[PDB]
Amino acid sequence: IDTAAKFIGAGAATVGVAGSGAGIGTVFGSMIIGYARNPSLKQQLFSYAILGFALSEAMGLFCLMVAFLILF
Amino acid sequence: IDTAAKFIGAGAATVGVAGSGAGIGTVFGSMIIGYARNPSLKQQLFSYAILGFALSEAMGLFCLMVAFLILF
Amino acid sequence: IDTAAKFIGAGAATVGVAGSGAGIGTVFGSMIIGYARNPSLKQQLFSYAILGFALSEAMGLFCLMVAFLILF
Amino acid sequence: VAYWRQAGLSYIRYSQICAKAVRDALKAEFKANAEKTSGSNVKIVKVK
Amino acid sequence: DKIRGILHRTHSDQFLVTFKEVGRKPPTFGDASVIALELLNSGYEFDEGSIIFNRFRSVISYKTEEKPIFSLDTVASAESMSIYDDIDADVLRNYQEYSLANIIYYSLK
Amino acid sequence: GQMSFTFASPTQVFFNGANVRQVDVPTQTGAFGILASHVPTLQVLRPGLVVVHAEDGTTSKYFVSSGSVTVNADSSVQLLAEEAVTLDMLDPGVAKANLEKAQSELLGAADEASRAEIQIRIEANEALVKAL
């Protein structure tokens, strides 16, 4: 009965990372419309997308680590 | 019952690619409305939308990779 | 008990096809607003939509493909 | 696009009316400077 | 008048419109709008042009000069406007008309 | 910083090469603010007030009618307007009466473009009262 809980738990805990990709498409989908209005690429705009991918994935990749301790 | 825990987990962890499915649908919804202002197409407008796709679908594809380990 | 794990893996895996159905509303929504700027439509404006529509549905079918593997 | 668009008007024909209303809301003191500009003096000659 | 009176012989069939009663009273901006309005609503859809006038240097010496008029929207749609912002072909239609009334008022003064 | 603001009527000049950090212009297709390094555009005007914020403690409440705002590549703008008057030359009392009379002719317009001319006139008097 311990085995029947560990495998449903982590697979439930994987669901949330779908939330992460559905915002992380926006943070490059705002930089496409960002650079196409004002070519300010090499300055601070592109580095925000480097922060923007790094931040929201940290909301995402921790949820995968939640799945591991249920599995282990 | 021991084989049943294999089946219940992957169908739950399947859905973590649903948002990453829509997370690539908006990065192409930008480049329509991005290019239609500034025809600088073959340059880094399109080359950035390539990078946003393969990064986001990989985080969806790793969600399918854990579906196999719950399966196997 | 052996039949019951077939249908949770059938029901829960089919859920993820909802997400990519949300994505192709974006790209066909964005082609309406991109055309209203710059009527160069029969060129790569409309062709990028059929680029994007095939690429998002490929993820959603990739979600639906495990529903036929794990059920059978 | 607006209502003055898609009905067959020009932006000068827009700009004539909205500037004429400002010259009607002026007082009695600054009415002469609305009479000053008042640029209806050029005649029209087309040969046909 | 005296432009039309000189050119009445050689070029009587290349006239579009002629504007008389000019120069008695001082010119104003309303007369630069009367002329520029009738240059559009005539039926003649043109694509380039130029204006000739006498820009003066001093009391003694003037000079007859030459200045072009980019009236067409698509010749004003080149590489140097793709850097610019959200201007469409409707905003640039309204803007390029207004600069026709500002080159006439410059020429009239 | 390092801006240039020019504000000229046909007959008079308000600002020449003197910039103060923030310009508010009523655009035909919305509104904007000039951040002294704004991404450059070529816009045209609607009837509405221009409130230039001087450095100088206070603001400056002008009211244009129809002009053109050209912010350019270097940090420098050129705002030219046709009827750029201040507030105290206008009377509010005549501006109240001019509204509903142009609404009365709106139903009495038989043609489609002559009625479209009436829709231009009611919009300018609507921005007249609310600015006051």
Automatic annotation (TrEMBL), chains A, B, C:
Residues in V-ATPase proteolipid subunit C-like domain copies: 8-70
UniProt name for this protein: ATP synthase lipid-binding protein
Membrane-topology annotation of the record: Multi-pass membrane protein
Transmembrane helix keyword on record: yes
Protein family per UniProt: Belongs to the ATPase C chain family.
GO cellular component: mitochondrial membrane; proton-transporting ATP synthase complex; proton-transporting two-sector ATPase complex, proton-transporting domain
Top-rank taxon, per record: Eukaryota
Mitochondrion listed as a keyword: yes
Subcellular location: Mitochondrion membrane
GO biological process: proton motive force-driven ATP synthesis
The entry's keywords: CF(0), Hydrogen ion transport, Ion transport, Lipid-binding, Membrane, Methylation, Mitochondrion, Transit peptide, Transmembrane, Transmembrane helix, Transport
Full-sequence range covered: 63 to 134 of 136
GO molecular function per UniProt: lipid binding; proton transmembrane transporter activity
Stretches that traverse the bilayer: 7-33, 45-72
Main location: mitochondrion
TrEMBL record, chain D:
Listed GO CC annotations: mitochondrial inner membrane; proton-transporting ATP synthase complex
GO molecular function, one term: proton-transporting ATP synthase activity, rotational mechanism
SUPFAM superfamilies: Epsilon subunit of mitochondrial F1F0-ATP synthase (SSF48690)
Superkingdom classification of source: Eukaryota
Main location group: mitochondrion
Membership in a protein family: Belongs to the eukaryotic ATPase epsilon family.
Gene: ATP5E
Cellular location(s): Mitochondrion inner membrane
Keywords for this protein: Acetylation, ATP synthesis, CF(1), Hydrogen ion transport, Ion transport, Membrane, Mitochondrion, Mitochondrion inner membrane, Transport
Keyword Lyase: no
Protein name in the entry: ATP synthase, H+ transporting, mitochondrial F1 complex, epsilon subunit
Pfam families: ATP-synt_Eps
Protein's UniProt keywords contain Metal-binding: no
InterPro entries, sorted: ATP_synth_F1_esu_mt, ATP_synth_F1_esu_sf_mt
UniProtKB/TrEMBL annotation, chain F:
Keywords: Acetylation, ATP synthesis, CF(1), Hydrogen ion transport, Ion transport, Membrane, Mitochondrion, Mitochondrion inner membrane, Transit peptide, Transport
An annotated GO cellular component: proton-transporting ATP synthase complex
Highest taxon listed in the record's lineage: Eukaryota
Lipoprotein recorded as keyword: no
Domain ATP synthase F1 complex delta/epsilon subunit N-terminal residue range list: 3-84
Transmembrane segments: none
Localisation: Mitochondrion inner membrane
GO molecular function: proton-transporting ATP synthase activity, rotational mechanism
Every F1F0-ATP synthase delta subunit C-terminal domain range: 90-131
Major localisation: mitochondrion
Function: Subunit delta, of the mitochondrial membrane ATP synthase complex (F(1)F(0) ATP synthase or Complex V) that produces ATP from ADP in the presence of a proton gradient across the membrane which is generated by electron transport complexes of the respiratory chain. ATP synthase complex consist of a soluble F(1) head domain - the catalytic core - and a membrane F(1) domain - the membrane proton channel. These two domains are linked by a central stalk rotating inside the F(1) region and a stationary peripheral stalk.
Record's subunit section: Component of the ATP synthase complex composed at least of ATP5F1A/subunit alpha, ATP5F1B/subunit beta, ATP5MC1/subunit c (homooctomer), MT-ATP6/subunit a, MT-ATP8/subunit 8, ATP5ME/subunit e, ATP5MF/subunit f, ATP5MG/subunit g, ATP5MK/subunit k, ATP5MJ/subunit j, ATP5F1C/subunit gamma, ATP5F1D/subunit delta, ATP5F1E/subunit epsilon, ATP5PF/subunit F6, ATP5PB/subunit b, ATP5PD/subunit d, ATP5PO/subunit OSCP.
Family classification: Belongs to the ATPase epsilon chain family.
Protein's name according to its UniProt entry: ATP synthase F(1) complex subunit delta, mitochondrial
Organism of this sequence: Sus scrofa
Coverage span on the entire protein: 36 to 167 of 168
